Amino acid sequence: ALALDGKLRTDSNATAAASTDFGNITSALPAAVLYPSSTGDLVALLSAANSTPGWPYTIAFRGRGHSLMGQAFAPGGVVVNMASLGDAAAPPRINVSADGRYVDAGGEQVWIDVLRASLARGVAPRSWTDYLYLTVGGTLSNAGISGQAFRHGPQISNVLEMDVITGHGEMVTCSKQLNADLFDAVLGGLGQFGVITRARIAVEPAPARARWVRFVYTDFAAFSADQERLTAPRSFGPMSYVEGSVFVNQSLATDLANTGFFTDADVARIVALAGERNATTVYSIEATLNYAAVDQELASVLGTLSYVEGFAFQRDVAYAAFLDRVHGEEVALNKLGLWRVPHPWLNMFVPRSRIADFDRGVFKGILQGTDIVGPLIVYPLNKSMWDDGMSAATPSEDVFYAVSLLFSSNDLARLQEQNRRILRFCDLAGIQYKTYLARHTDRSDWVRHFGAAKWNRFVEMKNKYDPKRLLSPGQDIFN
Ligand SMILES: *Cc1cc2c(cc1C)nc1c(=O)[nH]c(=O)nc-1n2C[C@H](O)[C@H](O)[C@H](O)COP(=O)(O)OP(=O)(O)OC[C@H]1O[C@@H](n2cnc3c(N)ncnc32)[C@H](O)[C@@H]1O
Ligand SMILES: *[C@@H]1O[C@H](CO)[C@@H](O[C@@H]2O[C@H](CO)[C@@H](O)[C@H](O)[C@H]2NC(C)=O)[C@H](O)[C@H]1NC(C)=O
Ligand SMILES: *[C@@H]1O[C@H](CO)[C@@H](O)[C@H](O)[C@H]1NC(C)=O
Ligand SMILES: *[C@@H]1O[C@H](CO)[C@@H](O)[C@H](O)[C@H]1NC(C)=O
Ligand SMILES: *[C@@H]1O[C@H](CO)[C@@H](O)[C@H](O)[C@H]1NC(C)=O
């Protein structure tokens, strides 16, 4: 029925396209790929799966395939090409509310398009990812983090309601007020319980511009203390965005130039500073202030900090230009053939109490004497802005750090071994980290990830909403 309407494709080109992802490390061929024209086509697929004894196929929902390790694959199953839902000109897949207090976006829609539609109405989401060509449904199935998360929470903390089609093939609207169990389960739920077809996203009046700063440190203690100062609850401080970067000695000049922030003269100055201090690691805080008045506001904030004098670097850009900054990085890297390469990325949340230990073992230890390509990102988050009732798993401490080591790749094998070594260091040091964007491959690891109480809830929701265990099998939780 769906195949006759040209929606369910089994041809080699279709299956091949749905068999690889951004990670470029693992691959898995699906039996078929659905190209739905409407949510009705998704209901039809999931209802058939629910009602058919001996239903053969697991089902995955491909956003834009930005997964690192096959999370969007359905080996010998059906991959849903979610993007197809946004093919038609009418009706619109992104609706800013009449009063401009929220935006309704299709699960398949990319955040860059959500931004553009929001700005047309003078508004914008409050919480972002660093990179905007990701789907609403995709990031909400994980968490969605960037430099705003310390004060607004992750993207999953900025959703009012969702439309979800469950593994039973039932279309359900959920929120804190209605079907809250499904609402909580789906958010950070790794595509396990149903497909998000619509999410209601909180917005704020859009700032016009961003004052954009980078501050340089050679001392980790000063660097991390200042990050924590900038992101501390008062309500929060003036800064709209706070992240940080780590630069190892061997690839210092190259990595500093690769930020796209520093000029060649700026890079030379930082290299000279590291040299005079014999520093093996350099650290940079990246922060923005959304808006003569800005000058004094910025001066007042910087006066509370302890970066190396003479090493505050400033840019002033349009708000939208700041948010979409990484798009220009992709275009440039792809032209050099350096974008579509293996990405053995390591992402985790590290408790505040152990971040100095992590720095000693990893940045000052394991990563020393290697040529690093890709950013090493480190910044604090506030647990208070996360809802522990949702599926997403975080460390127990009030403050924990996002640590994102975004390695680009003989080299791949070395990098995979290096990541195993970093994880081994953390385990032996007894650091109670949580991975982010990673899939585990056995039960014990997944139970450890969630913790006993949250795992038991996760299973309860799985039995209620996907009892056949069909959905997002690439997560390797129930498959
Ligand atoms: C590619 C990449 C990823 C990325 C990033 C930069 C790059 C270049 N920067 C990020 C950032 O700054 N902050 C952050 O939180 N994440 C960042 N990412 C990682 C990204 O969030 C993940 O890749 C995420 O999966 C979103 O990517 P995408 O939208 O392409 O989704 P997918 O990989 O195809 O699918 C991921 C899993 O989710 C399930 N899924 C997908 N759509 C839905 C819907 N609508 N409903 C329910 N589940 C869904 C898939 O089945 C899969 O398991
Ligand atoms: C954006 O709003 C429009 C209303 O203008 C929605 O379009 C309707 O969608 C329903 C269900 O998909 C259809 O039955 C109607 O025919 C559509 N009406 C119109 C006027 O075209 C659209 O669904 C909204 N988009 C999202 C993602 O919420
Ligand atoms: C990774 O990308 C290359 C193209 O550069 C391709 O030949 C290869 O099949 C891909 N590998 C995986 C596992 O996706
Ligand atoms: C799911 O399958 C059951 C049969 O076990 C059936 O009673 C129910 O109506 C189905 N739901 C949908 C929406 O397909
Ligand atoms: C930094 O690396 C260079 C090699 O490129 C080396 O000459 C220098 O001694 C290193 N500095 C420190 C303090 O490790």
- Give the domains, in start order, of the chain with CATH numbers: 1-81+437-479 (3.30.43.10), 82-208 (3.30.465.10), 209-436 (3.40.462.10)
Which ligand has the minimum distance to the alpha carbon of residue 172?
Answer: 4
Query: CA 474, CA 71: separation in Å to the nearest integer?
Result: 4
For residue 371 the two structure tokens come to 């040529």
400 is in an annotated binding site: no
Which amino acid residue places its CA nearest to atom 10 of ligand 4?
51
Q: Which residues are catalytic?
A: 66, 130, 243
Rounded distance from Cα 103 to ligand 2 centre (Å):
13
| Cis upstream peptide for 91 (omega within 30°) | yes
Burial 305-329 (b: 16+ CB within 10 A, else e): bebbeebbbeeeeebbebbbbeeeb
Q: Is 162 helix (H, G, I), strand (E, B) or coil?
A: strand
Sign of CA dihedral 435, 439, 444, 449: positive
- Whether 112 and 132 have beta carbons less than 8 Å apart is answered as yes
285 closest CA partner among 245, 339, 237, 235 = 245
Which amino acid residue places its CA nearest to atom 4 of ligand 5?
250
- Whether 44 and 2 have beta carbons less than 8 Å apart is answered as yes
Resolution, angstroms, 1 dp: 1.7
Ligand 5 atom, smallest distance to 279 CA? 13
365 is in an annotated binding site: no
Query: CA 169, CA 44: separation in Å to the nearest integer?
Result: 7
Elucidation method: X-ray
Q: Which of 104, 110, 173 to mutate to test the pocket of ligand 2 (most atoms within 8 A of CB)?
A: 104
Which residues on neighbouring strands pair with residue 233, listed in sequence order?
A: 236
Calculate Rg over the CA atoms of the chain.
22
Query: CA 131, CA 141: separation in Å to the nearest integer?
Result: 16
Rounded distance from Cα 102 to ligand 1 centre (Å):
22
404 is in an annotated binding site: yes
Rounded distance from Cα 279 to ligand 5 centre (Å):
9
Q: Is the CB of 249 under 6 A from ligand 5?
A: yes
Backbone region of residue 121 per phi and psi (left: phi > 0; alpha: psi in -120 to 50; beta: other values): alpha
- Whether 351 and 396 have beta carbons less than 8 Å apart is answered as yes
Strands 346-351 and 434-435, how do they pair? antiparallel
Q: Is the CB of 370 under 6 A from ligand 5?
A: no
Calculate the CA 283 to chain-centre distance: 22
Contacts with 247 (C-beta within 8 Å, 6 or more apart), sequence order: 255, 256, 281, 282, 283, 284, 376
Strands 399-405 and 376-382, how do they pair? antiparallel
Rounded distance from Cα 452 to ligand 1 centre (Å):
26
135 is in an annotated binding site: yes
Backbone region of residue 144 per phi and psi (left: phi > 0; alpha: psi in -120 to 50; beta: other values): left
* Long-range contacts from 466-470, C-beta under 8 angstroms, 24+ separation: 466/166, 466/167, 466/168, 466/192, 466/193, 466/194, 467/167, 468/49, 468/50, 468/55, 468/167, 469/58, 470/49, 470/55, 470/57, 470/58, 470/59, 470/77, 470/167
